[model samples]
Target chain A: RMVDLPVIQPRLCTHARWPAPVYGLLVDPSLPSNPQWQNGRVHVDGTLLGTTPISGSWVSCFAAEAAYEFQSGTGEVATFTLIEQDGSAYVPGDRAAPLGYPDFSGQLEIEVQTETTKTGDKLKVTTFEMILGPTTNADQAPYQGRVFASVTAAASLDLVDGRVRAVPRSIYGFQDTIPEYNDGLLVPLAPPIGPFLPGEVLLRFRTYMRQIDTADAAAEAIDCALPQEFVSWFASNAFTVQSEALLLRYRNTLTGQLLFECKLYNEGYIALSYSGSGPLTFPTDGIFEVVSWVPRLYQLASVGSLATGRMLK
Target chain B: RMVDLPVIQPRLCTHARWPAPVYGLLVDPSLPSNPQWQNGRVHVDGTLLGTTPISGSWVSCFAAEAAYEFQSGTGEVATFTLIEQDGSAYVPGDRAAPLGYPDFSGQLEIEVQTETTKTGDKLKVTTFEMILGPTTNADQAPYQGRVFASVTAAASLDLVDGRVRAVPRSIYGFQDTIPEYNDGLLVPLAPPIGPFLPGEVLLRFRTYMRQIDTADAAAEAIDCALPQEFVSWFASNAFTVQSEALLLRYRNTLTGQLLFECKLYNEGYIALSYSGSGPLTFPTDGIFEVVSWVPRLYQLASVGSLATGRMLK
Candidate 1:
């Protein structure tokens, strides 16, 4: 029940090899995004998808069961129609070919363990992002909304040359996610975030697992200050299920409606239905919930320096 | 992108054929159902629903996204989930199953107004619960959202049972839900409640709803009172592209928010999210961002009564 999840250090180019955890703000065109946000800059990618804020939509979070509530939910995030993806400044922007998947994914962290798996003592973790750049005259293909972005985890100890070169070179590239900081186990969460909100978030955080048995994988941490998505990765150990009941409902941002309802339990069956006008979707202006830290870490990090030197009685 | 939804109440016995959202606290075998709680309770058919709380599981009298600080969602309340048919005495020993439903719905005396239904003029909402007789039978139907005694909304000011039961018989059923009696519409919430609580809940108010379109088949008064699969319901909303992007990432409940790093906005697609543990049901026990109130009302009343009375402004 109690375990230590770790951080991995690797070089930049090797990132495309593994999966990693991610945490950051979901951008929505309906609402104003952070002053700095662009999609063309492709990094790690898995799938991509999109939705137009219309009559309907859907639903969880991470294992705060692990630590701070960590997750990447679609939420009231900012988004653009594929039609819009290229119509704006993002047009002509470096785009990745659609892997014919759903939505885009970004890695938050990659765990480092003696063994590369969740069962491993969550050794070191690395968070990063991969953008599925828009296809540029590439052979036309069906654009699956899924697989827009994907980040993986890897096992690595040293970070150098602006990247951490993980042990295995290129299986699921554990290349540099955020180009800047190097060599330490922890990768700082970027802009708009100084640290994981110091407190417990209702989350279920685990680790980025890789299927080395299936693919020829390798990873390399890259050099260069990367985007914010890559920087927002962290780890935790104590995550518990307060109650698998994640009640789902929708309130109209305009008319005040209770669209549908459902429950998210550990049984893997989460339900949602509408009673009001309809499915509550990403708002027109785009909205998201924000939870601030509780501050236990502020003290732990201050006087303790977060070293393995101290032990709880 | 927005449309009107309707609420339809099931006819008397028909209510039974439908899956009534009900939850009865299992009596601890060691104890016996409170014999005092039940008397020879024989009705035209069975027994009537109780008027108040029988256990911890039953708390909130109504339903909504019960919250602490509008930001942190603590619980959801599906008043009907705690209601049942068979009247059973819940003596920490005997298993108890009772029926009850929300005592009120719709917030009034607020600036929030709907161009559609109006809880202002045409209705006379009153919360009428069955007065349970002393213990005479083996058990009694505990108070909950499912075992509703009666509801009358927007009638033609006619005479039923010899006199006018009052149209829209109080959109909120009772005063406790009127907001004016307890605190306000935005009071912090607790679990689904019967008639008992740590606070004094007043019951002395008459609200109404201004009926909007009774025609448009597309939009109907919503009756979300029955229980629906909480799990499968959420999954059904998945859009090919929307599911991939949003589903790929987990949500972080802490710091209270979802961090969506990768996002896609499709053409006409929209989504809404919910984050609460059990407390809400089909009638909805949690908070949601929506576009209208018709859906909220339908889910709450299931088409039985559109109070259209909770209005101010």
Candidate 2:
């Protein structure tokens, strides 16, 4: 009986004049061996609509001046279809199980919002607002250069047509946090990426998420950063020599499938971590699941800092 | 230049009065085998921060009246936290895997979202939208009653306050579908299910989703009802009588773990079936795919008069 919810008022851009751009790339390309990864470019105004790898054949991020205001005047033309599913970590030519993209699962088309009425028919999408861009376009995976990419998106809205749409049913976007950092936020991995000598920060962090259909959102953050890589490889080899622990295998690289085994600091050994979740929609069933992470350790001299540097806390 | 956008006319319910229901559930009990699952009762007026089973823990669904329209007009009171992860199908008494409960990941609190104003002091959280609800609650898995549940969500919106915050990214919800039933919608499985002959048909299909945040959201559509139970146990034993070639094995009910092996279908020996996608972001290793649907082969005299029939199209 203790209820109070009136935090609403962050929705502008209600067609004073602007609706010409709308590109998308919530990708998913299907797969043979699967590794084409194109689209992912175009930003703001919006258009691309590939299919899972982003969008699909019906492909359409469509934009006729963008259009958005299905009420209080009327002017609709909102078309979208994104399904980008990526999860980075193991690189080489790629594909021991790259990130996501197996057989293509059904291929994207969750009725991802079509609505039309400028002249066409179809209007009446209602509302679907689901956001989590983590900062839009990361880079389109030119083929993986900067590395550390984290993406998970889902949106299909059409207010005015259906009415009521409140409370953060969904919305999330990030890209390193700030520095103006382009709204397309793409964390291609950049930090003290490690050469490690200082307690060997094995920091193998590679968190992936795009579970539009479910799998517990690929187990969320797979444990933030593998417990700082099991205490940075148990302080980088527990005390050096490279041998005495840490035997690894943990592979699932999109089909190579192994998933399990890792012994360091033998606290009973359990470093495999839940390596699951992939696919935006359609049918996708790659399944990753490797799960495990529990760290609270802190400090390498106190993770030094002028503002932010070497933070494991 | 294919322009003609104008269909706006719906945006009334603003301040006229409405802002009293806002609940959340992003749960992450943090596991010990995790299965406390409470917070899932509420219906509306807000109050259930639950901490990531689906996101934090306060738990609320409230609707005494439900309201929303506070953009500094003054009345304050906008507190929220929702992380409700639901993945129906496994039902029994519940909690082995019981529709996802693996001790909870991280346990919600990325700092999530916090805004104050009624008296708390702080109002600013700008736009960030991502959608993909499939339908909302897919059954809620009592253990596995109806079966097939897909849910994935993420929403940390602190609009107006913090100026413009939208990161750590956002994320989901969806249910079932039916249209005449697209040959592509494959829900298959039908009625109290079988027992008999008459060209038998089992079809146990369920495709899941809802990638909100590493909730250990393990995918469980495991190839839609095990390839229609290898074609309904060979269309219920291809006219039965024994030996045309058969050799099987498949375990795992809940930690039995074995699952695999078959021979059947000697249409002269053939049972390959595509079967893919369950997880990994997209090319995971670098795979990225986009798959589609294809299952149209009717017979049983084209499944006419129906009898727990005409199910799989």
Candidate 3:
């Protein structure tokens, strides 16, 4: 006698969703201090301009050709473009020289606005937040976290003449920053994917700052402190082979230093405690944020409360 | 009621047999600067320095000593010894200075002789060749292959004044040198072991060479090429988890320069095709090789292939 049964299959999400291909570019050709202040549009594409859509649970890379004829009303001379493509280091055009800067590399984080201010600026300029590079993992995959290797004012399109009014810095992409929770409705967390061992870990990727200016104020200008109303977003997420947990890495921007790091496990119900100095303050200029973080898997190593895991972004 | 038929137990051969333990030494205190000249002994230990006996497919490590180390007839101002401890880098003694070299790290190969020569009177120098460091695979286990990272003129126990007399070289360790067919031999190509995956590969450890003399003649003097009667020995061999073929990497000595590389897969048989130039000649002096290669495992990405396997050698 033969017994008949139904076979079922599940839909799969290809890693293709996260489009991080080679030959990508991010640029803002104009800044407020430029003569063309408030008169330009930011461009990103394989063609030197840029984009930021709410791509679902993944993002991927593609290259196409086109034109961006928009010009800012300011007619400014201080403008430039930043590019990281074709396996090359982030290449910032000469326009960024005003700030004694060059090309930069990192996850693009742009804040575009239409509401003009008394400052006569419709756009506040662009920023390149730090993200781990392909070298950080065995897969040569990027690290998903806000713990950045930020290089502000690298594209000439931004301001700062290497003087007091302008300051450029770098944030090490070395720290470990993992996603903590989901904040959106209707959509739940994405399904987890990994090849992480039961007891491995994402060792913290640390960072450093490339400071060009002399004043401490400019040096202190990078806002690295965490805010009270933390906005939780899933830049990326990863789970372990064993039961899981959460891991976070916090650090200072201009100083390119680590400030806080935490991990929480479920089964044993554990948390990594902090034992450092002052809850450091962030510069009033910007707010340090948790950007593209991936969840890290934690497994205890032996007895005395130690744990480890890999970074799955 | 439990049915007991026959708890059949299979006979198992643990690779543990070919255990090339530490405390292994390959010494040639001297070698004539001439081509076919050697007036000394190349000593290895396991008992009176001789053992081709299977002694039970297994060997362990031990260290003890006794001496008379009478200096060679080499009234020879230049001569040296090479030793690979029970477990560590091959240690080259200071006698290599005349050859213009430094401390070396690699697998050991010693060619012994019975008929002595007179030219050996000046200097019957010695050498140590580096294979990929244990860093080749994530395991940090030893590199085992015939292709090597050799340097004959490296350590200066002898002399060349500083002109065009000598040169050192490396071996790519590639080519179709498999066990022909002892299809019926008691020995089975040691049971195949591994689960390594696709897209993943074993990166050949790169190497560097130091130069003391500058002439092209000295540089080209290295001897590298398979001889007609190749020995039937097992140093390093790799197999795929799926039906796959072979991959080979051939590069230059210093900076571990890349000359060429290739890969192939199979259904019935496989072949490695070369595209670049040069049967690729090696300097006449030395040939580097991996004497104890461990097999790499490959598996599927979903859940199994991703796990790392144990050392087979």
Candidate 4:
């Protein structure tokens, strides 16, 4: 006659649904009317803008400058910037994912290109630079970095030049379109880097548009797609974790000039929009392309398929 | 004896840097801003839009046909539908890694309401159904289906006593708001469906906003997240599977007067864009919403928490 029982397992504890609205912007290069026109800039769902160019790069957002059940912070756009000069190797998992399978004989080349275009502008250079930004996770601040490589092509009218043959390897530096600011971009003594050669490329990045990753690099690496888990891990840690901010973001003009400008209180992100606000989340990995844009039907002979792992250009 | 040769791991296969995009639209309650906002109602991003005299029952989405992605399947205009409902009911698992976890619940109701100010405004519930479209991975076709619900609350005066009171649950049907269809008007289906209830509700088929499984049910069964392994399992059985079409995307507005609706595309995902002519290859869970001239707050009482254990509206 004396037992205290819990109020019969109460059911409701949280608001299951709300009228709050979430937004998205995706771009598709496959569209015939795309602004960049057949240049191959892919589009995501919510964005009206097209993809970044081959020599150029772009970003979609920084980290969640605030929280997301609704944003506690603002300007935390996730982003990324990638490009190819005359040469580049590959990003971290690229080589493994492509080369790891059984019975795979992919060729790697130290390539050299005579010309490249960014947003339709041609550039002259012995090399090129590709800088990527915005960390995959919020725990990591100001995701940013550069890679280097050498390339060599052939052209000569005088006898001093070597006989007709494969070109020699030359060198290039990756360009940073946006300067890394506070948390808006990733910062590391040695960020992820890779070298490259030109051909058809299938570039892929971890960022999926406006979806911002938390700063924990471990968590980002674990499940960039697994948001619920990411949310839980962040919830468990955000109480004491000090939010890091990058004061600036990476920036670069189409002329191949690169700079890593810094700012204060910036939620890590690469500002990619030419007009609107800075710091957009990245959808496509980066500008992927062949040194020579060749149609699939023709399948050029002088160049190669970076996508198929051939070396010709 | 056979002599073993040197082992060589070639770097070749499939390594691609793919940039994914998530989009957002700036919602203006005044005018349906998104291009996909054409036929649907409007709501803003940050403003609460549902309410009722009673605190518990809130109006959810202003029902409309739209998507979270921009690209459409049948229409040329691609767009996104803001989410109005969500929840997490486990599916049950015994193994590990891809084991039991609290995952997304179900998308039960896409809320809508009678014209708050005027009559004959807002979406009409008729021939409503949620259609699951094609996917990148075919195993996700024909989407999954579960029991879903919708609601509209009103204050009615008792005829004999002339007292203003909430409409008690009753089974009534009438022509729907849409001229071509009929909506089940007064048949309120609340909690205690089948055997599971919060122990408070006694009616069957009458729904609740939360998903509360009886203690006995939980003890005897397991609630699991969507099985990631199912993708592979279904893939292995590809020989016996058929591709799924985008079928049934509206409510059965037949024989009933309705105010709101919710549906789920059980298959994978169908992508769309306003500018492009192609549908997409999305392979994730998503939701859509629409609203027009509904009182801002109250109506969206129970929605979008992915837990059947907690989904009582």
* DockQ of the candidate models in sequence: 0.01, 0.01, 0.01, 0.01
User: Worst ten-residue run, lDDT, model 2 chain A?
Assistant: A12-21
lDDT of 1 by residue, B235-263 (tens): 22222331211111212333434322111
Model 4 backbone overlap count? 178
Q: What is the lDDT of residue B11 in candidate 1?
A: 16
Classified by CAPRI criteria, candidate 3 counts as incorrect
Against the true chain A, what TM-score does chain A of candidate 1 give? 0.18
TM-score of each: 0.17, 0.20, 0.19, 0.18
Candidate 3's TM-score: 0.19
- Candidate 3 local lDDT, B23-54, one digit each (tens): 11011112111111010101111111111111
In candidate 2, which residue ranges exceed 4 Å CA deviation?
A: A1-192, A195-313, B1-141, B144-313
Q: For candidate 2, write residues A263-293 as lDDT tens digits.
A: 2222212222211222221111121232222
Off by over 4 Å in 1: A1-171, A174-204, A213-313, B1-313
Off by over 4 Å in 4: A1-194, A199-313, B1-226, B229-313
* Positional deviation of residue B15's Cα in model 1 after best superposition, in angstroms: 24
| Candidate 1: Cα lDDT at B148 | 18
